[PDB]
Amino acid sequence: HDREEVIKANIRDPLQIIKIVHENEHLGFLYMISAVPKSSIEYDTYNLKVVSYENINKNDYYTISKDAVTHVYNDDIEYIEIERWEQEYLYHRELTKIPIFALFRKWKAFSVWRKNVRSKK
Amino acid sequence: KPELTEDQKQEIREAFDLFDADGTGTIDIKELKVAMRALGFEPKKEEIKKMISEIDKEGTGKMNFSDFLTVMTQKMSEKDTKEEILKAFKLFDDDETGKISFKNLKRVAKELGENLTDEELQEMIDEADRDGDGEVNEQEFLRIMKK
Amino acid sequence: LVCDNGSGLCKAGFAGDDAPRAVFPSIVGRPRHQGVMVGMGQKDSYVGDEAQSKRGILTLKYPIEHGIITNWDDMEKIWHHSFYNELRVAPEEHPTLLTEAPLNPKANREKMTQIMFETFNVPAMYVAIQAVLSLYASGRTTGIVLDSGDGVTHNVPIYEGYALPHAIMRLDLAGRDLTDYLMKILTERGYSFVTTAEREIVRDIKEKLCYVALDFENEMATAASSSSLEKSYELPDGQVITIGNERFRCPETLFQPSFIGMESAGIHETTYNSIMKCDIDIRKDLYANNVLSGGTTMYPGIADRMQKEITALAPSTMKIKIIAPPERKYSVWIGGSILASLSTFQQMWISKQEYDEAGPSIVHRKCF
Amino acid sequence: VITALSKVRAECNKVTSMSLFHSSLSKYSRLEEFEQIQSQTFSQVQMFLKDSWISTLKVAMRGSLRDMSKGWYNLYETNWEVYLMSKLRKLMELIKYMLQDTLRFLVQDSLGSFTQFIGDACC
Amino acid sequence: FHKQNTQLELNITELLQKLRATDQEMRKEQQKERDLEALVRRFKTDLHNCVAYIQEPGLLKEKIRGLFEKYVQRADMVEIAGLNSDLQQEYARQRE
Amino acid sequence: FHKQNTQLELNITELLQKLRATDQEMRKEQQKERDLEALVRRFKTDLHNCVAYIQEPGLLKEKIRGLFEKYVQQEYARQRE
């Protein structure tokens, strides 16, 4: 494989991204940005496009390397070793199954509706 | 005082116990942070050290299940910035009208599973429709829910 | 602390909760074999959900029915389990509020007061009459109550927070009577659902699927001609049930007790009779302020049909409004817990020292 | 918890070879002496169980439990719900099972032996 | 009207107490930022004074030791040091 | 009652103006605090770095000169850009 070619291939699964960066060391490091911004309601932290590096938002972007993963937001940085990122993605998969976590914004909001109406009457 | 249901406790229990198979009954504050951001909230180092100061006078690095549950309950308890309120309404409305039709509510109810009656649903609509237009705008939803 | 002998569904909460922390079914079990069969028999007592789960080794009754505490020991068992398991507390830290049906004989009233005081550690305590605080949940001081689905079916006219004892009467139908008629009409239709499991499934059916016809003759002719008005239900066994005229025939028994074979005027006409018993000045307020309560009222259509039927009975000068709290199968508990919340109510209680000389007399008096 | 449970097992293991009755008599006796010695035996075993055995096992297990810190096993529970959630409650309920089982064996072995002892006279 | 006037009286007395709380809180903010700038001024003058000592190596050694003992605390800087070492790995390899 | 109503509505509106003003002033103080505290970070981290720097007196002198110059008036990523 070759680096710009794999960029243009436009695969987006973090598992496959990790596999690709592990497999093809000569293709170097890759930065990635999310298939919708955080502003979306269907936003996902773990669905992302991998892009030519200038295109990313300067203020919020993710980065990975076969050595390490790293993230930056608003000049705040955290450094990660890839197995941490992978297992945190696995956690997110299973945590996302969790019925309340899958629904929590509904759970709390509609509960507040119930409370407010009955408390008021 | 904040509370959540026994079934919510059961779910949180499965969360805790899957978070590490090591069966310790205590797990890393770092993993609590991973949990919160998996919920969708990434709190900052000031909040990290604040919660650590709650959990671990001794500095095990670990919540027990009761700490994990209680901090979860508290972070669940408070009011959100407008973005999350918009997310809530956007999930409540998939007519994409900006209106919670009774249909929209009824589907949300069937989704969450609580069997509350049709008159009860229509009554919380009616009070939530703070302008009495026929159902609740995202404006009317804001107006009631911010109170 | 709040305590309800709710005879369709009993309930408990701390005072000023938003809902009863505990809700539990109106039963206590005894071992059905006289010997302890196996170490599960650590007690001879199985209150509430214990009986519901364990029926087959257990002796099964609604301990109360209709107007009275029937079986004082078994009720004391229920209350003891309510405090220690359901309220999960030793109560004496906080005042306790308790329910009784209207026109409970004063002998029972004092007997209960004594039983609660001597058997349970307590600071101060009161038993309240379900209609009166049920009306408090309406917010009126001045109103007539109806209740059905948690007890026998009462009418109670209330002026400025108190009844006209002159004007209290029952209609001798309870939640079972609805299940009985529905079982009859299901067996006519051919389902023959009557077994204790079938009995519970039919109670679920009657609770959710009942509706009250706006004009029964018309609605019945409509559904029998137009089966599009009869609606499908899935049984736990995967059968589909169709329910139609049964949806409103069952509540119609309240309007035509002869449907369940009862030789009585309907709920509407017995309410009208109760109103007529009182002062016409109160009567106008009762027509202005009717409150209906209990699981049977929870249904759709009941309050509209009742509004129409009372308007048909009521003089044309009377304004008619059925007041239908969405919660009304809890009305008493809501009113009681709210009232008990008030620290100014704390002076109303009766406590140990006055309880000695005053207490037998003073509770009997404050119970009105 | 191993040390605690093995300790209570030892307590049962002397308990299981106690007796609830004096299934032994040297020679003939008159009635009142039977009543005295049996009622004494019952009182002795009742004090032994209620004061001695329960207190002994309770303080011994507590002493072992004492220094298990935060976790499921926390002696210092503060919520009935979480206790019911905990392994700790389930362990305790197993202790309840074991000590009931053992006293059941003691009851059976006392009653059977005593009856057989009468049997060898009456048969 | 009478109910409206009374409600406005209760509102305005509440809003007065809220005003007074806000005024005292912003007073605390202002004195806090005054103290923060006084700290910054003390830093600046310390730097200018150790620059004045700089002309003698022993005097600079004592100034660096004194300002070290006064200012430093391990703070986040130990964590910053570790994560900077890791980021330095990333930087060096991607630079290469 | 009309005159009293107008008085009380005016005075409440005036106090809501007071609270809006005090909010704006709190936002100005928030700006001041933010900038001062970030400068406290900058100075203390530079001090920690000059302490960590090579305490060879020539090197320490040069580091002091660097701080003096920059105060009298994240990088590598920007260079990678």
Side-chain angles (χ1 to χ4, degrees):
Chain A
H1 307 282
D2 210 351
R3 70 165 302 296
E4 289 190 53
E5 139 195 315
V6 172
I7 292 292
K8 294 162 198 183
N10 212 329
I11 195 167
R12 298 195 187 172
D13 174 7
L15 171 64
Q16 304 306 321
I17 288 165
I18 290 161
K19 180 182 178 179
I20 286 161
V21 66
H22 173 81
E23 284 173 3
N24 307 273
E25 299 190 327
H26 30 274
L27 306 192
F29 66 96
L30 300 170
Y31 300 169
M32 62 293 297
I33 44 162
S34 60
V36 74
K38 190 183 177 180
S39 59
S40 178
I41 307 95
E42 52 74 55
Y43 172 71
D44 184 359
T45 63
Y46 289 102
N47 200 323
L48 314 170
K49 200 175 73 179
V50 190
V51 300
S52 46
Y53 314 96
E54 75 276 35
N55 298 100
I56 71 186
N57 173 19
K58 217 83 174 199
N59 268 64
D60 184 14
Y61 62 88
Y62 295 86
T63 70
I64 81 188
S65 63
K66 186 172 177 270
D67 326 62
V69 175
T70 279
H71 167 71
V72 179
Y73 173 92
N74 291 5
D75 223 16
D76 288 332
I77 302 104
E78 261 287 36
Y79 168 99
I80 301 98
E81 315 92 327
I82 76 178
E83 306 188 1
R84 278 290 307 202
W85 197 60
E86 182 190 14
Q87 78 196 261
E88 290 160 24
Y89 179 47
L90 298 174
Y91 273 143
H92 184 265
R93 305 188 315 199
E94 311 324 324
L95 289 169
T96 298
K97 293 188 177 68
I98 296 295
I100 182 157
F101 303 164
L103 302 173
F104 175 64
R105 232 156 288 276
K106 302 188 172 86
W107 197 108
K108 78 167 184 180
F110 60 55
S111 303
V112 176
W113 288 59
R114 321 314 187 219
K115 287 195 297 182
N116 276 34
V117 304
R118 67 201 64 233
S119 63
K120 190 48 49 190
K121 59 188 164 173
Chain B
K1 188 272 152 184
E3 65 184 6
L4 283 179
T5 87
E6 291 60 42
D7 288 335
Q8 270 64 78
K9 299 169 212 265
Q10 168 63 7
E11 288 153 5
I12 289 164
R13 219 301 305 288
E14 293 214 319
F16 185 84
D17 70 40
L18 199 65
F19 237 112
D20 197 333
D22 195 35
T24 49
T26 79
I27 57 172
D28 213 286
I29 337 298
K30 190 94 70 172
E31 279 48 280
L32 159 68
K33 313 321 306 178
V34 177
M36 301 313 297
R37 49 228 182 196
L39 307 191
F41 313 87
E42 171 52 331
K44 306 308 180 70
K45 69 185 191 299
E46 301 73 17
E47 315 183 63
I48 303 178
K49 63 88 180 186
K50 174 60 168 68
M51 279 60 178
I52 287 167
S53 79
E54 312 301 347
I55 307 312
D56 218 339
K57 307 302 188 289
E58 190 273 324
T60 321
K62 315 291 173 187
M63 294 74 55
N64 103 96
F65 188 65
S66 69
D67 319 313
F68 182 81
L69 175 60
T70 48
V71 305
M72 283 290 180
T73 305
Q74 282 287 2
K75 239 297 175 188
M76 290 153 171
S77 299
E78 86 283 0
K79 296 179 180 179
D80 305 325
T81 71
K82 59 177 168 60
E83 299 69 25
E84 310 311 316
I85 310 299
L86 291 164
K87 294 182 191 161
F89 199 94
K90 292 263 58 177
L91 295 166
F92 300 155
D93 188 0
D94 70 350
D95 294 330
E96 295 290 3
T97 49
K99 300 297 306 193
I100 309 314
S101 61
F102 169 64
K103 190 60 51 63
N104 260 323
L105 174 66
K106 186 66 177 184
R107 65 167 186 81
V108 175
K110 293 181 301 180
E111 288 160 34
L112 92 93
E114 81 186 345
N115 75 333
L116 275 55
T117 72
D118 302 338
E119 79 166 323
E120 184 159 26
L121 271 40
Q122 288 182 4
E123 193 189 52
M124 46 67 44
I125 291 173
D126 184 37
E127 179 53 46
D129 178 8
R130 285 275 79 250
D131 291 326
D133 84 10
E135 69 282 327
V136 198
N137 279 87
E138 60 197 318
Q139 163 54 210
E140 280 102 57
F141 161 61
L142 274 161
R143 294 253 297 292
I144 183 64
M145 210 56 32
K146 195 169 179 180
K147 197 167 187 171
Chain C
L1 304 177
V2 176
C3 168
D4 176 34
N5 302 301
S7 294
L9 169 74
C10 39
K11 328 175 185 61
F14 224 113
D17 286 326
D18 286 1
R21 288 175 182 281
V23 298
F24 44 98
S26 314
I27 179 166
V28 59
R30 204 63 23 81
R32 193 189 297 188
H33 182 47
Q34 284 56 60
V36 175
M37 279 305 304
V38 72
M40 69 81 207
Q42 185 193 38
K43 309 89 167 176
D44 77 329
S45 62
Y46 292 86
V47 171
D49 190 54
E50 297 281 38
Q52 185 61 22
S53 52
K54 296 161 184 87
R55 302 162 311 312
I57 72 177
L58 294 181
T59 70
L60 313 178
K61 55 184 175 178
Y62 286 82
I64 283 167
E65 76 167 355
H66 296 44
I68 66 176
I69 295 163
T70 48
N71 182 170
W72 294 94
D73 46 340
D74 284 308
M75 242 61 51
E76 290 152 30
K77 277 184 164 64
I78 290 162
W79 308 330
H80 182 287
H81 182 99
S82 304
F83 297 121
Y84 287 102
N85 300 70
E86 304 305 344
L87 296 162
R88 197 47 58 150
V89 291
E92 54 267 60
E93 191 81 325
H94 275 275
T96 303
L97 180 62
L98 302 100
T99 62
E100 69 176 355
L103 190 59
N104 176 33
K106 65 196 71 178
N108 299 339
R109 177 171 269 164
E110 253 280 87
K111 172 59 164 175
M112 178 44 180
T113 303
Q114 267 75 86
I115 287 160
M116 183 50 52
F117 182 92
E118 289 104 64
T119 309
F120 305 100
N121 308 346
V122 61
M125 81 310 291
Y126 187 65
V127 199
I129 290 70
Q130 288 159 39
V132 181
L133 309 191
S134 297
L135 207 90
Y136 276 24
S138 85
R140 282 71 168 168
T141 64
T142 299
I144 179 164
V145 171
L146 175 144
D147 187 286
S148 184
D150 195 26
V152 69
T153 295
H154 303 282
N155 275 125
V156 183
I158 307 163
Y159 168 78
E160 290 302 342
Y162 185 72
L164 299 309
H166 291 152
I168 288 62
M169 45 277 296
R170 298 71 151 102
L171 164 58
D172 293 334
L173 307 175
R176 288 165 287 146
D177 301 81
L178 294 306
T179 64
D180 301 329
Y181 180 83
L182 187 53
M183 287 157 58
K184 294 191 178 195
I185 75 189
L186 290 171
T187 305
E188 152 208 316
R189 188 146 177 158
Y191 308 117
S192 189
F193 261 53
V194 300
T195 317
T196 58
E198 299 176 327
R199 175 76 169 187
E200 298 282 51
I201 291 162
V202 170
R203 181 146 55 190
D204 157 84
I205 286 167
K206 79 90 176 173
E207 284 282 297
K208 73 201 186 191
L209 307 189
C210 283
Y211 150 76
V212 196
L214 179 58
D215 199 38
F216 176 91
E217 174 184 322
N218 188 79
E219 300 325 287
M220 210 305 299
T222 303
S225 59
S226 190
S227 60
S228 59
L229 294 189
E230 68 167 24
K231 306 304 186 184
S232 54
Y233 167 93
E234 178 177 333
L235 277 167
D237 59 24
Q239 172 168 351
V240 180
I241 279 176
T242 304
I243 201 78
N245 56 67
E246 302 89 347
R247 296 163 48 257
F248 52 88
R249 283 166 69 184
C250 188
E252 197 64 17
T253 62
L254 296 182
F255 305 82
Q256 268 61 36
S258 56
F259 282 18
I260 186 50
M262 245 308 296
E263 296 187 332
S264 177
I267 48 159
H268 59 316
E269 178 164 11
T270 52
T271 299
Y272 182 77
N273 170 289
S274 176
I275 292 175
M276 286 296 184
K277 204 84 171 193
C278 87
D279 176 354
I280 53 173
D281 185 25
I282 281 56
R283 296 184 206 170
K284 90 201 187 302
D285 307 340
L286 304 188
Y287 288 115
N289 307 277
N290 291 270
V291 177
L292 86 174
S293 177
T296 314
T297 66
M298 221 82 170
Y299 309 162
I302 179 58
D304 184 11
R305 175 57 175 299
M306 184 192 187
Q307 171 76 4
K308 170 263 188 164
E309 288 296 331
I310 295 296
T311 304
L313 299 180
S316 186
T317 55
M318 292 295 103
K319 59 168 59 66
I320 316 301
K321 185 165 181 178
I322 308 313
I323 304 160
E327 325 73 9
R328 56 192 168 286
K329 84 183 178 166
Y330 296 80
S331 303
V332 58
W333 175 96
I334 296 165
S337 58
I338 291 163
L339 175 61
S341 78
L342 182 59
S343 62
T344 325
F345 195 77
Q346 179 279 339
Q347 301 84 66
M348 188 50 71
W349 304 117
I350 313 81
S351 78
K352 294 300 191 175
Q353 66 91 44
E354 67 273 12
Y355 180 85
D356 295 339
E357 313 93 339
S361 83
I362 202 176
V363 181
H364 168 29
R365 180 154 67 260
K366 282 186 168 184
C367 292
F368 317 123
Chain D
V1 316
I2 295 311
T3 65
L5 205 175
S6 57
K7 190 52 48 70
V8 309
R9 172 165 288 276
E11 308 306 344
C12 293
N13 269 259
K14 52 193 167 82
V15 115
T16 183
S17 203
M18 297 171 192
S19 72
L20 298 163
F21 297 74
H22 184 199
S23 182
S24 177
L25 293 177
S26 55
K27 59 123 180 61
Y28 65 78
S29 178
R30 218 174 175 282
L31 163 59
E32 297 79 5
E33 314 324 316
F34 286 86
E35 177 166 41
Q36 283 163 93
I37 68 194
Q38 304 298 358
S39 67
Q40 286 158 10
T41 299
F42 309 149
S43 73
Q44 266 59 87
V45 298
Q46 170 54 348
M47 63 183 63
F48 185 96
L49 285 168
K50 88 187 176 62
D51 311 336
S52 196
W53 203 65
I54 298 307
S55 68
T56 295
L57 89 91
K58 178 261 186 179
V59 304
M61 82 73 71
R62 171 61 154 293
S64 175
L65 268 288
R66 190 200 307 105
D67 305 305
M68 176 46 57
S69 55
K70 62 172 174 178
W72 297 130
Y73 292 95
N74 197 354
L75 284 169
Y76 318 125
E77 253 286 21
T78 75
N79 182 359
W80 209 310
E81 305 154 12
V82 181
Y83 191 17
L84 275 163
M85 200 66 72
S86 74
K87 281 185 182 176
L88 182 63
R89 174 143 276 261
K90 299 172 191 181
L91 162 63
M92 143 61 201
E93 288 170 3
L94 263 298
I95 309 172
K96 181 238 65 178
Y97 269 115
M98 273 89 75
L99 102 169
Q100 286 181 15
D101 148 12
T102 51
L103 63 81
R104 158 174 177 88
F105 276 106
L106 170 63
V107 168
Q108 290 193 350
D109 298 343
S110 304
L111 290 173
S113 58
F114 164 42
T115 311
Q116 188 76 341
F117 150 99
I118 302 304
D120 287 330
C122 294
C123 59
Chain E
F1 271 91
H2 183 73
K3 70 87 193 178
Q4 196 69 5
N5 293 359
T6 309
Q7 189 278 356
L8 290 160
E9 256 276 277
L10 273 296
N11 284 199
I12 200 179
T13 50
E14 170 270 301
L15 186 54
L16 287 170
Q17 297 298 98
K18 178 64 178 292
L19 192 174
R20 286 164 180 165
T22 315
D23 162 275
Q24 295 298 288
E25 202 65 20
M26 70 75 172
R27 168 59 57 74
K28 300 169 199 171
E29 299 185 307
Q30 191 143 107
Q31 63 90 58
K32 178 186 170 194
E33 71 78 39
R34 288 301 84 218
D35 277 1
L36 285 170
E37 189 160 44
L39 167 64
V40 171
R41 181 179 57 75
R42 283 172 169 143
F43 154 72
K44 284 184 176 186
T45 51
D46 286 344
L47 176 58
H48 298 144
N49 289 4
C50 76
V51 165
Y53 271 37
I54 206 166
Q55 34 65 28
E56 168 48 45
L59 291 189
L60 186 63
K61 206 86 172 196
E62 288 175 29
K63 284 288 168 191
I64 186 62
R65 294 289 85 78
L67 300 179
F68 155 69
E69 187 282 329
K70 176 178 183 174
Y71 295 121
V72 308
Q73 190 265 110
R74 281 168 284 275
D76 294 353
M77 277 300 295
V78 292
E79 293 270 33
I80 290 166
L83 64 92
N84 282 0
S85 309
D86 307 336
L87 293 165
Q88 177 174 2
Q89 315 306 304
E90 176 215 323
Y91 287 124
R93 292 179 187 179
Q94 80 197 349
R95 280 167 61 193
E96 182 276 339
Chain F
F1 299 125
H2 296 177
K3 184 157 61 203
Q4 291 161 11
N5 175 78
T6 66
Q7 286 174 340
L8 294 166
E9 186 73 287
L10 174 61
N11 293 356
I12 194 77
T13 302
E14 190 223 320
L15 293 194
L16 293 169
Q17 299 169 6
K18 301 286 186 287
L19 274 300
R20 285 185 288 262
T22 315
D23 156 78
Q24 298 295 283
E25 290 167 33
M26 171 163 62
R27 307 317 164 178
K28 295 178 181 179
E29 300 318 85
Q30 173 70 105
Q31 179 73 34
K32 299 174 191 293
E33 292 185 39
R34 276 266 289 102
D35 288 339
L36 288 167
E37 293 180 6
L39 184 56
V40 176
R41 181 198 73 88
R42 283 173 280 178
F43 107 67
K44 280 206 177 195
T45 56
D46 288 340
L47 182 283
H48 195 83
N49 189 258
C50 81
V51 168
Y53 202 78
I54 312 305
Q55 69 270 63
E56 160 47 46
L59 274 288
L60 180 63
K61 286 172 182 181
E62 287 177 23
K63 188 55 170 177
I64 290 293
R65 293 180 189 166
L67 300 195
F68 165 86
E69 178 179 316
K70 68 186 67 185
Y71 288 109
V72 159
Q73 184 67 10
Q74 78 199 309
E75 313 96 306
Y76 301 154
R78 297 154 161 80
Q79 317 316 304
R80 304 313 100 225
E81 308 175 22

